[PDB]
Design a protein around this motif. Structure first.
Motif, short mmCIF file in Angstrom:
data_model
loop_
_atom_site.label_atom_id
_atom_site.label_comp_id
_atom_site.label_asym_id
_atom_site.label_seq_id
_atom_site.Cartn_x
_atom_site.Cartn_y
_atom_site.Cartn_z
N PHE A 71 -1.29 4.06 -0.51
CA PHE A 71 -1.28 2.69 -0.02
C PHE A 71 -0.99 2.63 1.48
O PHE A 71 -1.74 2.01 2.24
CB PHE A 71 -0.27 1.83 -0.80
CG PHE A 71 -0.03 0.48 -0.19
CD1 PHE A 71 -0.98 -0.53 -0.31
CD2 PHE A 71 1.13 0.23 0.53
CE1 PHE A 71 -0.78 -1.78 0.27
CE2 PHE A 71 1.35 -1.02 1.12
CZ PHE A 71 0.39 -2.03 0.98
N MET A 72 0.10 3.27 1.90
CA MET A 72 0.50 3.29 3.31
C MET A 72 -0.65 3.65 4.24
O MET A 72 -0.92 2.94 5.21
CB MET A 72 1.68 4.26 3.52
CG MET A 72 3.03 3.71 3.10
SD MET A 72 4.10 3.25 4.48
CE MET A 72 3.50 1.61 4.91
N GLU A 73 -1.36 4.74 3.92
CA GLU A 73 -2.47 5.21 4.73
C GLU A 73 -3.66 4.24 4.71
O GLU A 73 -4.03 3.70 5.75
CB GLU A 73 -2.90 6.61 4.29
CG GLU A 73 -1.86 7.69 4.56
CD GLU A 73 -2.35 9.08 4.23
OE1 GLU A 73 -2.51 9.89 5.17
OE2 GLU A 73 -2.59 9.37 3.03
N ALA A 74 -4.24 4.02 3.53
CA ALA A 74 -5.32 3.05 3.38
C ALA A 74 -4.91 1.97 2.39
O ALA A 74 -5.00 2.16 1.18
CB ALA A 74 -6.60 3.74 2.94
N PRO A 75 -4.42 0.83 2.91
CA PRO A 75 -4.01 -0.28 2.05
C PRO A 75 -5.19 -1.04 1.46
O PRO A 75 -6.29 -1.02 2.01
CB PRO A 75 -3.22 -1.20 3.00
CG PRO A 75 -3.04 -0.41 4.26
CD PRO A 75 -4.20 0.52 4.33
N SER A 76 -4.95 -1.70 0.33
CA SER A 76 -5.94 -2.51 -0.37
C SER A 76 -5.23 -3.44 -1.33
O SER A 76 -4.09 -3.19 -1.74
CB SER A 76 -6.92 -1.62 -1.14
OG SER A 76 -7.75 -2.39 -2.01
N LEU A 77 -5.91 -4.53 -1.71
CA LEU A 77 -5.37 -5.44 -2.72
C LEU A 77 -5.48 -4.84 -4.11
O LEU A 77 -4.78 -5.26 -5.03
CB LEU A 77 -6.07 -6.80 -2.66
CG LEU A 77 -5.22 -7.99 -3.13
CD1 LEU A 77 -4.07 -8.25 -2.16
CD2 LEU A 77 -6.06 -9.24 -3.31
N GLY A 78 -6.35 -3.84 -4.26
CA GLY A 78 -6.54 -3.11 -5.51
C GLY A 78 -5.25 -2.55 -6.08
O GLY A 78 -5.12 -2.40 -7.30
N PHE A 79 -4.29 -2.25 -5.21
CA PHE A 79 -2.97 -1.77 -5.61
C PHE A 79 -2.12 -2.83 -6.32
O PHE A 79 -1.01 -2.54 -6.78
CB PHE A 79 -2.20 -1.20 -4.41
CG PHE A 79 -2.76 0.08 -3.86
CD1 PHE A 79 -3.50 0.08 -2.68
CD2 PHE A 79 -2.56 1.28 -4.53
CE1 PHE A 79 -4.02 1.27 -2.17
CE2 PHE A 79 -3.09 2.47 -4.03
CZ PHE A 79 -3.82 2.47 -2.85
N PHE A 80 -2.63 -4.06 -6.39
CA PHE A 80 -1.92 -5.18 -7.02
C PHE A 80 -2.74 -5.77 -8.16
O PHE A 80 -2.22 -6.56 -8.97
CB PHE A 80 -1.57 -6.25 -5.99
CG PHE A 80 -0.44 -5.87 -5.08
CD1 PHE A 80 -0.69 -5.21 -3.88
CD2 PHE A 80 0.88 -6.15 -5.43
CE1 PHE A 80 0.36 -4.84 -3.04
CE2 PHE A 80 1.93 -5.79 -4.59
CZ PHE A 80 1.67 -5.14 -3.39
N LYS A 81 -4.01 -5.40 -8.21
CA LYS A 81 -4.88 -5.79 -9.31
C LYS A 81 -4.84 -4.71 -10.38
O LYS A 81 -4.92 -3.52 -10.06
CB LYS A 81 -6.31 -6.02 -8.80
CG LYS A 81 -6.42 -7.17 -7.81
CD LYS A 81 -7.84 -7.68 -7.62
CE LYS A 81 -7.86 -8.92 -6.73
NZ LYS A 81 -9.23 -9.44 -6.47
#
Ligand SMILES: Nc1ccn([C@@H]2O[C@H](COP(=O)(O)OP(=O)(O)OP(=O)(O)O)[C@@H](O)[C@H]2O)c(=O)n1
Ligand SMILES: Nc1ccn([C@@H]2O[C@H](COP(=O)(O)OP(=O)(O)OP(=O)(O)O)[C@@H](O)[C@H]2O)c(=O)n1
Ligand SMILES: [Ca+2]
Lengths: 441, 437
Positions: free
Chosen positions: B245-255
């Motif tokens: 997440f830190m490196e390449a963040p996305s909303l996918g980490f919450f979906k």
RNA sequence: GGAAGUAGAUGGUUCAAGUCCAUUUACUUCCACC
RNA sequence: GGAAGUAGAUGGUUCAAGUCCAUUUACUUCCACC
């Protein structure tokens, strides 16, 4: 079936008869006459010169004694000269130490050059102790020859006579020392029952002790192991045979057993009963002597077995056979076919640096975490032991013996199924799988 | 796109809308009115009592405070009677500690009897620590307690939220503690990357020391680990996820990822290409709660897995699934079939007595010597992993968990190949084989 | 030829090699062919 | 219910079991169900 009555019959199988003895006396006479007249210092040594040779195994050993000042080059040129000069017909074929093999009046003769030393210390050639062995045994073996012949017969009938690489068993000289050490065949057998892998027999000192390995100390040179090339396994078989012989004494122990012709159909049944993978590596026999070829076959056998084991094919045992023209490496595995995927261990989730480059790879599946480390699914480039070996031997021929590996570079094939049961390897196949009743006379 | 831009777009899926909040308040009131009607001392604890629940994870935790005079058995009967006469409909089902679960005006509620204490150290029951927990958090989590709801949402989307056995992950409370210890979810994510399995976080002392094990020390009891049920592998997953997440963040980490439906035909194709043996043990699910089942399914899964390995079938991984009516122990092995013969190690040649015994057993094939033993060819009872597990489960049902084992004892079957891809186990087989698309 | 040992080197595989698969230089042994 | 721990007691497999497979008794600590 008394023990002593058994051994009396055994004598008729191991003492040569009158006609053979005379044949050798007549040859001996001719050889002497040719070697005198040639000038030449020589000495009869070995089993003929000690009357310890086995019935049907008559072969005379002549040792030519040269000045130690001679080069090794000079030794071979001259040995070969005289050997050629003295034998009716002859053959020259050896591994390291040169000599002439021939016939004098229909009997096998070996003319061997060596160095006239005094004291077998320091030794200029491999065979220089042999004349001394003979001086030593000469007067200590009189009246005990038949005794030596029983042991020889007993060993040979059980395929462990001779210390060449083909057999890796008991030399004839070793037999003599044992007889000198124990007094009789019966005493040896009785005692051998409790030899161990750490057993040291020191003949000259009349002593048995614990060492690092099995070691029969040469009377003429204490740094020498008369049993250097007896394999652990052959020692084991001998110890076991002695145990068996004393439990149930039988003339069977002095009669040879032969392979027995077993039909391909029955072999197909056994293999499928065991449900194993059975196959051989077939290739041209390299035109070299037995003592070069056999250790090379041993190495080739071993390295492929090791390949099979690290590659999880679960090899059972391994065998080899040499024909006039082909060699065969025989193998049996528990696994006929392995899956294609396997797991490769990865780094602990801790250090990212390594985890990063571990996951950077292109794989079909997707690494996972198990017990605090990464693992990955990877694919095999073969799934049968045959395919495995084909890859191995095409790629690693150079590690399979100088000449054996060279021959495999130029041609090999892998035989299994019915195709293998019609090859002349059934004796080795049966031995390998421990087929019962195989095996006769 | 950038640093804290993503955290904005996520807070939509974590913070509940007013009308879910409004349904829950009108349920909260009704509950006070029923309890006070009956007298009864009651403390509200949990997520609702702290404004830290997910958009859709509406549950209300109520704790009944009984004087110590009443014993452990007296405690539960009155706690149950109160809970039953306070919830519209109710469900009683628990593993060791008694509680009623039910619905008020259409809202999930828990009523849990416990003890009132001075001092936390020296517990009586099990949950006695929980009111204490809340009174340590009332004034510390106050403010941007949405740094918790992001953390929760983060862990929930990734299958590692709850700390119950089905999950072996992050406790809800464990989330609220880290936000106190680090300051914010993002700052917590930054640090979690450096975490080892030796990491010890002391919220009380502010001490990030390195002990023998991962140990989040509870501010209310320092002997007690708040992370005590988060597994080693689950820790690994988070620590990695944070890095990703830190490196390449996305909303996918919450979906939450859609559970991935692959057709039987594709699975068979994957498996046949893999060349493995894939089969399941299917048996009737015993009528027990999750927290008694999952550890038993693990047992169970592990003991058969070890059988497989000591039996040279070279298993790759295992997994398990619980349904309405059945359970499945899932296995994949590298060896589909082994030979009948194998080698057995006998004694060294010198040992003449034990050689006699060894050589006196009847076998189909003559024993042999190799490096100073004495080995024998022996024959197996089974040649396939499925054949093998049929036997092991039959004879070793009792070592496979109290109920799982009892269930296997009376019946199981072994499902493989074609018949298997029709069972509801395809998600598990995909995770297991690391299928990817 | 084969086997043991000592001291270097090289390629390959691997997240990662003094260690696994191989190759190679120098040296000290030992065994067989008798 | 599961896991860790201390003192025992068995049965099976095997040439051989303090080492492999299981079973049991007592003392203890932990976890989830909140
Ligand atoms: N591995 C060997 C081979 C031979 N010899 C010496 O070489 C002699 C001759 O050996 P060989 O001809 O090979 O056999 P024999 O000893 O003569 O006995 P037999 O022919 O019956 O085998 C032996 O007596 C022995 O002194 C030895 O010390 N070690
Ligand atoms: N493994 C756990 C889980 C819960 N608790 C206590 O029980 C309370 C309520 O936990 P629970 O109702 O099970 O979950 P929530 O904390 O409410 O989290 P969420 O609402 O998101 O499910 C926590 O605050 C904590 O004090 C605990 O100590 N041990
Ligand atoms: Ca001879």
């Amino acid at each position: 079936m008394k023990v002593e009555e058994i051994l009396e019959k055994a004598l008729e199988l191991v003492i040569p008869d009158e006609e053979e003895v005379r044949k050798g006396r007549e040859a001996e006479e001719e050889l002497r006459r040719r070697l005198d007249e040639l000038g030449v210092e020589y000495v009869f040594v070995g089993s003929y010169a000690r009357n310890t040779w086995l019935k049907g195994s008559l072969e005379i050993d002549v040792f030519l004694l040269f000045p130690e000042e001679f080069s090794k080059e000079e030794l071979r040129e001259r040995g070969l000269e005289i050997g050629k000069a003295v034998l009716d017909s002859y053959e020259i074929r050896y591994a390291e130490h040169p000599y002439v093999h021939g016939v004098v009046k229909g009997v096998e003769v070996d003319v061997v050059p060596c160095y006239k030393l005094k004291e077998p210390k320091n030794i200029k050639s491999a065979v220089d102790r042999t004349p001394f062995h003979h001086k030593w045994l000469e007067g200590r073996i009189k009246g005990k020859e038949n005794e030596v012949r029983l042991l020889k017969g007993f060993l040979k009938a059980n395929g462990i006579y001779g210390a060449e690489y083909k057999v890796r068993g008991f030399s004839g000289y070793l037999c003599e020392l044992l007889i000198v050490f124990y007094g009789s065949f019966l005493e040896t057998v009785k005692n051998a029952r409790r030899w161990t892998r750490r057993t040291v027999i020191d003949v000259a000192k009349g002593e048995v002790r614990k060492g690092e390995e099995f070691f029969v100390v040469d009377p003429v040179d204490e740094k020498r192991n008369v049993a250097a090339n007896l394999s652990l396994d052959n020692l084991a078989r001998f110890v076991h045979l002695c145990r068996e012989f004393m439990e149930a004494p039988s003339l069977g122990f002095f009669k040879p057993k032969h392979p027995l012709e077993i039909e391909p159909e029955r072999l197909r049944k056994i293999v499928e009963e065991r449900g194993t993978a059975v196959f051989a590596v077939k290739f041209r026999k390299p035109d070299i002597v037995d003592d070069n070829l056999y250790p090379q076959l041993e190495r080739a056998s071993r390295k492929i077995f090791e390949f099979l084991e690290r590659e999880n094919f679960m090899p059972l045992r391994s065998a080899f056979k040499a024909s006039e023209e082909f060699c065969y490496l025989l193998f049996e595995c528990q696994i006929k076919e392995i899956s294609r995927v396997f797991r490769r261990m990865g780094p602990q989730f801790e250090d990212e640096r390594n985890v990063k480059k571990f996951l950077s790879r292109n794989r079909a599946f997707r690494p996972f975490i198990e017990n605090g480390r990464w693992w990955a699914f990877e694919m095999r480039k073969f799934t049968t032991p045959e395919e495995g070996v084909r890859s191995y031997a095409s790629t690693h021929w150079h590690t399979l013996g100088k000449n054996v590996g060279e021959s495999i570079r130029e041609y090999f094939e892998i035989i299994s199924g019915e195709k293998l049961f019609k090859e002349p390897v059934t004796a080795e196949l049966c031995e390998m799988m421990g087929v019962k009743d195989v095996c006769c006379m």
